[PDB]
Amino acid sequence: GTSLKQAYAQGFLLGTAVNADIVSGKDAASAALVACHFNAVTAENVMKAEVVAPRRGVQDFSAADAFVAYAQRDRQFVVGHTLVWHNQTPEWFFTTADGRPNTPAQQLERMRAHIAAVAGRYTGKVQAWDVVNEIIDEDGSYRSTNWVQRVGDGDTVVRNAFAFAQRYAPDAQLYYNDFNAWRPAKREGIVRMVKMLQQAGVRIDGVGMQGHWGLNYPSLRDIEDAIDAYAALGVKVMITELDIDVLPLTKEGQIIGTGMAHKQFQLPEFKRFLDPYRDGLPADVQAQLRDRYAELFALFWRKRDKIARVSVWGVSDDMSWKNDYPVPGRTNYPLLFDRNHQPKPALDAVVAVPSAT
Amino acid sequence: TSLKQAYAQGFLLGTAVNADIVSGKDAASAALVACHFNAVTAENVMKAEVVAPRRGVQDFSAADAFVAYAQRDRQFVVGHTLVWHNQTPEWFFTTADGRPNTPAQQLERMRAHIAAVAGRYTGKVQAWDVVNEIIDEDGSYRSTNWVQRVGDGDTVVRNAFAFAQRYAPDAQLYYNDFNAWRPAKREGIVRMVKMLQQAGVRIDGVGMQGHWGLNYPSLRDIEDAIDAYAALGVKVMITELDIDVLPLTKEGQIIGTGMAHKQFQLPEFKRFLDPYRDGLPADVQAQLRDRYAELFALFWRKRDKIARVSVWGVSDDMSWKNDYPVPGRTNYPLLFDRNHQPKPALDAVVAVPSAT
């Protein structure tokens, strides 16, 4: 009847993350839905350092190339994810050919050579880059990441990363991407970083709030404050990896690390508590999910003048990362489409938001 | 009205004591130990890392004080843990050159340790937790430091109890473990006790730690465990009982340092994980009362199979359950509150032995 991209046409891009299988045509059901509903695509994994440059000297663009090729057939707004990130980056990035740690100079060269090969390969094809991903910590200070340690300084890492991105992809828009970006202390830290980039004269087009949120977090107040704060810097604001966790514990706050991947949580007494909806969502929780997605997009539409894009992290529940993370083997329901690729009650709610004058 | 008096005709009713109770710094808790309990377990002072901190360095000061404190009011002395994978310094498993110990080298380390700890308290300690937490959740042996070094799971348990029997003939020899109610784990402990008796090695009892919660475990599982351990002709004890009432941890027993991660100190998690900072709400205390009520009702019903029930602490504030598994939480797992006052749970427990 009326699709997502159509309903939100006059506000922002409505996007999704596509995996290898959607691009390959294996997951044809989800592929069909991407064409119907979405005007922006983000490669879920195939453009990360560890796929793109698995080993020293070895490159692999085969899957990344397919994604971009896939994006053209529907004239999609293409987001590149991601250039500089402490995760999913092979250890060789931080070591010399011997195994010794790279010097700041060697580390910055690796960064240059990587961005040059990745961002440079895709011009006028990829419209935006998640240049640096998740660098600021929960208190607003810099994360002591493999990059920060080897380059030496948080500011130097970010400064060069965007400088190199502006060089080899002058056409492309440049974003910073982070989770818990609604958190005042973290948000403030992100702001201080954008302001340093602007005053150093380097290019940054937008701030991306990932939005891996839940039924009980965070407040619309926190989110509106952050949208406003980023907007005040004259940069685009985007909700980039949106999904709503509904399962016990993980609906209360975002969890990082591998603590919940511990074998003890696969035990009878934990699986009963943590994985309670193995045969569909109860009507009431399904309704909570509906009203959560509704009230969130109602705030997005309220701030449409300050937002450029809202991207959900996947199409159908069955291939959401929230199933196996942070607890493997669970059954989460975090997206807009069920495992039979049918619109959840939440979709119709989301579509209906812009029609309220 | 006293705990030990109510449960006199069934089993010893004891508790764990800390350095503060022993030294008399916590006089409030100390006075309640004499009135209520007839058995004591040292909470930390007898653990390997305290007894023998560094290579060829020993420390019994606090451990000696625990034994002295026990004779003051004549109580059943349970020495806590001789062989355990946790709270045992790394030098136990290596040589002075830093090489990982050979099977022979490790059994010697085991011998010398039990000789130093168990031998020191002959006639003064009534029972020893000889081996602690060596079975996994599936019933097989945990690949612990001890198991790896000695080479074989059976060889560890066999020798530990053998060395305990030699260096402390007077004392009772127990195996203690958490999650003991679990069928898969239970059957593994049964196989282990069976192999010890087959080798003619002394083992007097199996200790179910009893670090439980509101939603775990089932009374079915708990009873089937007592029954199974009993049919092996040994005593069955609940050695470290407490009831976890806070979110997540009230669902199941957690181990490891996963929850100590700094992200759970964050506001959105502290709001979920630490709700009862202002006091335990009425309905939760009712749940806690009922939880203690049914468990002790069961213990009293199986009293001719149970030789000891010990709670892990006297007053809520001392309980490890506050800062573990989540640092800086307010938990309510014991029978006495932070003002050293009997909780509704206590009344219920004391009333069990004389109920219809």
XYZ file of C-alpha atoms in Angstrom, chain B residues 246-247 269-277 322 328-331:
16
model
C 18.029 -8.926 43.458
C 17.226 -9.049 39.691
C 21.724 -0.829 34.669
C 21.982 0.225 38.320
C 18.290 1.174 38.100
C 17.471 -2.379 36.969
C 20.062 -4.394 38.937
C 19.998 -2.498 42.262
C 16.325 -1.591 42.956
C 16.121 -1.990 46.738
C 18.641 0.606 47.959
C 26.105 -7.453 47.958
C 28.213 -2.073 45.056
C 24.705 -3.544 45.251
C 22.316 -3.755 48.204
C 21.184 -7.382 48.619
